[PDB]
Amino acid sequence: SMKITVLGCGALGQLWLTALCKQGHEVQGWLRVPQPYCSVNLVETDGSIFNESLTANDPDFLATSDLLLVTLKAWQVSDAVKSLASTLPVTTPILLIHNGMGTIEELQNIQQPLLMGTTTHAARRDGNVIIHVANGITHIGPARQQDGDYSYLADILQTVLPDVAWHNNIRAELWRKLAVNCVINPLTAIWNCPNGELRHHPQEIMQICEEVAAVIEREGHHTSAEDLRDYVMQVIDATAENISSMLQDIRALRHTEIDYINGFLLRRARAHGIAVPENTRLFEMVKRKESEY
Numbered sequence: 001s002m003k004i005t006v007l008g009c010g011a012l013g014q015l016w017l018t019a020l021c022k023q024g025h026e027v028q029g030w031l032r033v034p035q036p037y038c039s040v041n042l043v044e045t046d047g048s049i050f051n052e053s054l055t056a057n058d059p060d061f062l063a064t065s066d067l068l069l070v071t072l073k074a075w076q077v078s079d080a081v082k083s084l085a086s087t088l089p090v091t092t093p094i095l096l097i098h099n100g101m102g103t104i105e106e107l108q109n110i111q112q113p114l115l116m117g118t119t120t121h122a123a124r125r126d127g128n129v130i131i132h133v134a135n136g137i138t139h140i141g142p143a144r145q146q147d148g149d150y151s152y153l154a155d156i157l158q159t160v161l162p163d164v165a166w167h168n169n170i171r172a173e174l175w176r177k178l179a180v181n182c183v184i185n186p187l188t189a190i191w192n193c194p195n196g197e198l199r200h201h202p203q204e205i206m207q208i209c210e211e212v213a214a215v216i217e218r219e220g221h222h223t224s225a226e227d228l229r230d231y232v233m234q235v236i237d238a239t240a241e242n243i244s245s246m247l248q249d250i251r252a253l254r255h256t257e258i259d260y261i262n263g264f265l266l267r268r269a270r271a272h273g274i275a276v277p278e279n280t281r282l283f284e285m286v287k288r289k290e291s292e293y
């Protein structure tokens with residue numbers, strides 16, 4: 001029924017391409033370097049394997065797509081989206097799913113309906129396959145004031161890769177994800193540790209949460225440092241044995257998403273005159289680790 005272009009055919013993109021294929025939707029990948037085909041290779045939670053070769057980089061397929069689904073790293077997002085937006089119909093919604101925040105600020109002139117999403121699914125590259133590590137929920141809603149009700153997408157996507165929840169205002173959700181990510185990613189990348197080690201660092205966590213709560217406050221959302229801290233510990237307790245995405249990036253010598261996590265927090269703090277010494281130091285530490293490669 002649906003025709004979807006997936007931009008960013010990595011771990012997340014392949015997860016969605018597989019799911020969308022199993023429900024009989026028409027899909028293609030959009031790759032950085034144009035190629036004969038997009039190969040999709042996915043090991044599901046049980047152990048089953050999906051192997052397909054799909055259309056890639058077809059501009060006509062793009063011009064007649066019902067949705068652009070974007071599953072790029074946050075620093076890759078807005079240049080890639082801008083370059084596809086003049087071919088995609090002015091009416092086709094663009095759904096951004098990434099960690100961090102700050103991309104919407106880079107996409108103010110997009111004429112398409114723009115949607116933002118967070119997900120707790122986990123998918124990992126293991127050599128040449130993607131492994132679906134965990135199931136989860138994807139929260140989606142409008143990116144901007146002008147973007148309307150595309151809740152119909154949530155219904156459709158619930159039948160593809162549950163669970164999916166639509167929110168008329170997604171901001172609170174982005175901030176709560178940003179808060180946990182400001183804690184776990186830089187600290188794990190710095191200490192080279194599994195998430196669960198952070199349970200030994202309650203003072204540092206709480207210091208970061210106080211800074212985040214102060215900014216979220218000024219951005220017009222009711223929270224407290226204690227509430228954010230409680231949520232960080234839930235996430236830590238749930239993921240105790242995991243290697244965070246930022247630590248995985250570090251270990252693998254890839255560029256990190258720091259500019260859209262703590263980096264974005266710093267941008268919002270500075271815009272309001274909120275001193276965030278601890279987030280600043282974590283940001284500098286991650287940037288430094290990256291300069292060693």
Ligand SMILES: NC(=O)c1ccc[n+]([C@@H]2O[C@H](COP(=O)([O-])OP(=O)(O)OC[C@H]3O[C@@H](n4cnc5c(N)ncnc54)[C@H](OP(=O)(O)O)[C@@H]3O)[C@@H](O)[C@H]2O)c1
Nearest residue numbers: 008009010011012031032071072073074080098099122123
């Ligand atoms: N994986 C997960 O379990 C998970 C869970 C929750 C949230 N997320 C978030 O989702 C986002 C995507 O994560 P991921 O883990 O799926 O990353 P990923 O595996 O690196 O996938 C991104 C893909 O996009 C490709 N790409 C880079 N620039 C492109 C461009 N300009 N045009 C088309 N393709 C391009 C990359 O190829 P190259 O690497 O060759 O450049 C890569 O295959 C991140 O913000 C991440 O934090 C991931």
Ligand SMILES: CC(C)(CO)[C@@H](O)C(=O)[O-]
Nearest residue numbers: 181184185235239244245
């Ligand atoms: C919450 C989180 C930090 C758990 O590892 C995840 O967003 C990640 O790894 O990026």
